[PDB]
């Protein structure tokens, strides 16, 4: 029996502005901060603890983690910040208002761009300011592994090495893990963990700032899962 | 040539209350939060960046780091939190007001507790609430290595292994390192770095929340150091 807690970052600015975010490094709203703080308080009160946490390199997730740590009195635990946990990359949609985009390209198109397992949004041009190449966060990521766009499928491919190489061993080592990540990177990981089919994942949505608890057996096969609070 | 930036945590509740803190895990005051923020801005404006940061397991140091990372847009960097960077353990003095303590045991006595390199304050009882043993922060540290009190000499000895095993290799590795820690634990590191005598370390005081830049030669020998700011 292992427990693993997932939590999606609190409400970000672009969440609130209903803008596609992906790799753009936007921060938490005040509400996002509340949610993160409330999640940490929830975890504290339910008596949960952590020996390690995993996060992306995007401040909305890390700041959420911070608030969780702050509330749980766990600011001292090792935190692994991984670009592998990054939100799904939204290519040339990053920054665009979702309502405006669906008005322009149709809801269907947008729904494909948002939830197609295998078909990514349109890509960033390699020369877009928003491309990841010159970002210090990715300085050690081999260029050809940095996306200009992603579908969930890419996200799953990107997350898995972090799971296999780091999180799973941490869990089996008996470390109590928190993963603070993103809507679609958590969908990606959860797709893997729950062995969810390509069609079945399409409808999964994870609210901001709600601890999602996984109980895992000795082979790390999910037993059940549940949100806290 | 390398640069290493050191910063003592911003003002803490017990800094303001003039209380020996030690391993008591008190938080930053609002002033302390602002010092931490300002130090970040100052480093950001100076064009400083970091690849890795080292800190203690004490939130006053860690929150300072957070504010720095926040202001510098480096919330994603690896942070090693090590008990080895903890503030010097203050023993049975922890939580006591320094002024009343002086008023009771004498200025000399207090100053020997506070700045004598080799004489520790009086120890915590092993049964004291404040003893470290049940603390998850220290769960993997051998009991015998956990202090009930420390003089600076203990602090040095406690710090050096992190320096040798980890921070020095980072610096040699070409990593740009920030260490966010405490007055005495930095006094201890600096003693080693600058090769300050037992007598001389006595006067060294390190202000809250001010970046202290060391420029190190190839052999990690300080060439110069300066505070950033005023
Ligand atoms: O232990 C403490 O009270 C102070 C040092 O106090 P003095 O020994 O300098 O009085 O440490 P910090 O606030 O930097 O963590």
Residue numbers in the entry:
A (entry chain B): 1 to 229
B (entry chain A): 1 to 230
Paper text:
PGAM converts 3-phosphoglycerate to 2-phosphoglycerate through a ping-pong mechanism in which a phosphoenzyme transfers a phosphate group from an active-site histidine to 3-phosphoglycerate to form a 2,3-bisphosphoglycerate intermediate that subsequently transfers the phosphate from the 3-position to yield the 2-phospho­glycerate product and a reconstituted phosphoenzyme. As a key enzyme in glycolysis and energy metabolism, PGAM is a potential target for novel antibiotics. Here, we present six X-ray crystal structures of an additional Gram-negative bacterial PGAM from Burkholderia pseudomallei bound to various ligands.
Unexpectedly, the resultant crystal structure exhibited electron density consistent with the presence of 2,3-bisphospho­glycerate in one of the monomers and 3-phosphoglycerate along with phosphorylation at His9 in the other. These observations strongly suggest that PGAM is active in the P1 crystal form and that the 2,3-bisphosphoglycerate intermediate was generated by enzymatic con­version of 3-phosphoglycerate. Closer inspection shows that the active-site regions are even more similar, with all ligand-contacting amino-acid side chains except Arg115 adopting nearly identical conformations.
